[PDB]
């Protein structure tokens, strides 16, 4: 999720010394809110690092793409440098549309090096299958690797080797169908959009709260400084600060609850990498409908997309 930090002092007062002395005289709530805000960011950085940084070696796809007919130009890095993202990834990125002490911190891992992580991962899958996840990557022609997958599924190798064109045609076509569906059909990234919405809207609230009167004469603490003398000034300011402090604290708690939700979702995503992508999963429907064969990871604005191959009898 977006990493947000809120200057409690400024956001409550906004460059008002007497409001500051009132709030420091009110306790140490600004520390807690800040320091949860931190916790919750550095937790965001930790979701990303966990989910994506499983492999410590950046594997490069060969220059020669002879994978037994399987075409993975659509998921493999584009030499044209649209940020080095596959055409699926560009698609996903352009399918999601992204002052008072509320800043936004930048993520530790840029979109470029996330794409590079996914590329290393995806290349290590094509070359080595699951043995780049258990140690050092071992090459394999990928036709054999798919024979081994089939073996795992509960099919004999001859079924693949006899059928190798058909399966290749088929997996190309499925990739193309993913390509149209993500190109034309909308609402495909509803989860990531919903997260972005729900964050943006918590902010637009908390901002829009910042202009409430909470019983005071006015919501601008300057007009209360400029209209009243100390005693009733501090009175009205105290009311504003009670109200604002309530609003911040609501916000920060709601953000927390979400951060826990997102952390759960991210550790599910890390498990999905770890098992579906760096290996073949026996877990039924865990890595897609049907008998899992493999999965490919793709980056997104604020999440991951797994394209899972599975084998479906018919």
């Amino acid at each position: 999720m977006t990493k947000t930090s809120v200057d409690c002092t400024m956001y409550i007062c906004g460059d008002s010394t007497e409001c500051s002395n009132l709030l420091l005289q009110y306790g140490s709530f600004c520390t807690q809110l800040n320091r949860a805000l931190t916790g919750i960011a550095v937790e965001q950085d930790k979701n990303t690092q966990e989910v994506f940084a499983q492999v410590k070696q950046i594997y490069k796809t060969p220059p020669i793409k002879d994978f037994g007919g399987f075409n993975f130009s659509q998921i493999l890095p584009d030499p044209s440098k649209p940020s080095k993202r596959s055409f699926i990834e560009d698609l996903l990125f352009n399918k999601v549309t992204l002052f008072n002490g509320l800043t936004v911190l930048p993520p530790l891992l840029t979109d470029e090096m996330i794409a590079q992580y996914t590329s290393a991962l995806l290349a290590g899958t094509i070359t080595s299958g699951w043995t780049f996840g258990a140690g050092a990557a071992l090459q394999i022609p990928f036709a054999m690797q798919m024979a081994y997958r089939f073996n795992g599924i509960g099919v004999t190798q001859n079924v693949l080797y006899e059928n190798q064109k058909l399966i290749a045609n088929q997996f190309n076509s499925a990739i193309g169908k993913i390509q149209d569906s993500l190109s034309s059909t909308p609402s495909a990234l509803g989860k990531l959009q919903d997260v972005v919405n729900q964050n943006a809207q918590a902010l637009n609230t908390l901002v829009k709260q910042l202009s409430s009167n909470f019983g005071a004469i006015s919501s601008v603490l300057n007009d209360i400084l400029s209209r009243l003398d100390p005693p009733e000034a501090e009175v009205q300011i105290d009311r504003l600060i009670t109200g604002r402090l309530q609003s911040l604290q609501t916000y920060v708690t709601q953000q927390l609850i979400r951060a826990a939700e997102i952390r759960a979702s991210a550790n599910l995503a890390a498990t999905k990498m770890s098992e579906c992508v760096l290996g073949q999963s026996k877990r039924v429907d865990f890595c897609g409908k049907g008998y899992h064969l493999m999965s490919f990871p793709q980056s997104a604005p604020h999440g991951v997309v797994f394209l899972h191959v599975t084998y479906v009898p018919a």
Binding site: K56, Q57, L105, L108, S128, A137
Partner: protein, 400 residues
């Protein structure tokens, strides 16, 4: 004193772990405060009352009402041409900060010796019989000698003043009755003679009048307040751009930097608000120039330490701040000071952000992703392990 101490207090511990800690927040402040009100135009007609050629008699004091205009009392107060400036209820100065519903101007002419009786709590012939004022009025009396304008050769007898009358006059009473005053033998019944005298007498001003007997013009301005219609004066100031400034545009007060804007406002629109109703641009009324308001920079200070244990050398990162406004090295997370830029690429030690990290002199680089190795792929090549290793790891999980 220094960032490392500031961090030490922020953590309340004299021993700092290697990392980055967010200690404080740096703010810019407004300089060169400015106020701007529109180009210059509706002034009260005080001149029409003061310069007025004709004034009525003291007993026939002329009353005028002033409202729906702007009054500049500074010019009147700082004139030196008036010998009488007595404001009661409010200070003679700082009258430009007061706005009232109505103003009543009572003007007349007397002789100098009688200028004293016009004040609350006083008694006299003129006050009791010609012009009585309230004891607790809130206003100001102005007056000045008018010898050159009210003295005529042979006696200027147009000015009259009442002498005899029975009761007293109540506040704000205008009496024009000319009935012959009775001093008692029988009612005058519109007939004079014994014990029947004309109530009023003529001053008869002459050019050679003495200072006491010389004519004096008097005007009493009473302010009535109970929506105020007549307010104070618009010395606007000059416009300054590209600096954190405290600005006031037609009651809209704010802080920030004003810059030239490409936005096009409609003729009837003054200021523009961004989403969330936060002011974003303002049209300066004097020249109708549209200026974008940007909050003058502010943002967090994070302190990057390798650990007191290792070294007391520190680095500041000013976050989302263009540090031209403060080994300065610019990054997407802000700027870093105190840390040398290098082009190398190591594993990330202290994460700053946007793909830069720091490590220990304190060096700031671009984290490396890991040993980049290309697998020797060939469609008929496999790699098989010939040894193994029994690796024991530890996973810690909180329960309770």
């Amino acid at each position: 004193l220094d960032p490392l101490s500031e961090t030490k207090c922020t953590l309340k511990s004299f021993t700092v772990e290697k990392g980055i800690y967010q200690t404080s927040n740096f703010r810019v402040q407004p300089t060169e405060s400015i106020v701007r009100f529109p180009n210059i135009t509706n002034l009260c007609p005080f001149g029409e009352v003061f310069n007025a050629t004709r004034f009525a008699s003291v007993y026939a004091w002329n009353r005028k009402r002033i409202s729906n205009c702007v009054a500049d009392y500074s010019v009147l107060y700082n004139s030196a041409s008036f010998s009488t400036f007595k404001c009661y209820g409010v200070s003679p100065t700082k009258l430009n900060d007061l706005c009232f519903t109505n103003v009543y101007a009572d003007s007349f002419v007397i002789r100098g010796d009688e200028v004293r009786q016009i004040a609350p709590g006083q008694t006299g012939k003129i006050a009791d019989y010609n012009y009585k004022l309230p004891d607790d009025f809130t206003g100001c009396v102005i007056a000045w000698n008018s010898n050159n304008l009210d003295s005529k050769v042979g006696g200027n007898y147009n000015y009259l003043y009442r002498l005899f009358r029975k009761s007293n006059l109540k506040p704000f009473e205008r009496d024009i009755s000319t009935e012959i005053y009775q001093a008692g033998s029988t009612p005058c019944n519109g007939v004079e003679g014994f014990n029947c005298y004309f109530p009023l007498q003529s001053y008869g001003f002459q050019p050679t009048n003495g200072v006491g007997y010389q004519p004096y013009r008097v005007v009493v301005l009473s302010f009535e307040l109970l929506p105020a219609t007549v307010c104070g004066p618009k010395k606007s100031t000059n416009l300054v751009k590209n600096k954190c400034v405290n600005f006031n545009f037609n009651g809209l007060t704010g802080t920030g930097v004003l810059t030239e804007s490409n936005k096009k406002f409609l003729p009837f629109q003054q200021f523009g608000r961004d989403i969330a109703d936060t002011t974003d641009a303002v049209r300066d009324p004097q020249t109708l120039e549209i200026l974008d308001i940007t909050p003058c920079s502010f943002g967090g200070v994070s302190v990057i330490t390798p650990g007191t244990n290792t070294s007391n050398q520190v680095a500041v990162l000013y976050q989302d701040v263009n540090c031209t406004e403060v080994n300065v090295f610019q990054t997407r997370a802000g700027c870093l000071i105190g840390a040398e830029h290098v082009n190398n690429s190591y594993e990330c030690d202290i994460p700053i952000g946007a793909g830069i990290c720091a490590s220990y002199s304190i060096i700031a680089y671009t984290m490396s992703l890991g040993a980049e190795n290309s697998v020797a792929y060939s469609n008929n090549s496999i790699a098989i392990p010939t040894n193994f290793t029994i690796s024991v790891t530890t996973e810690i999980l909180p329960v309770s």
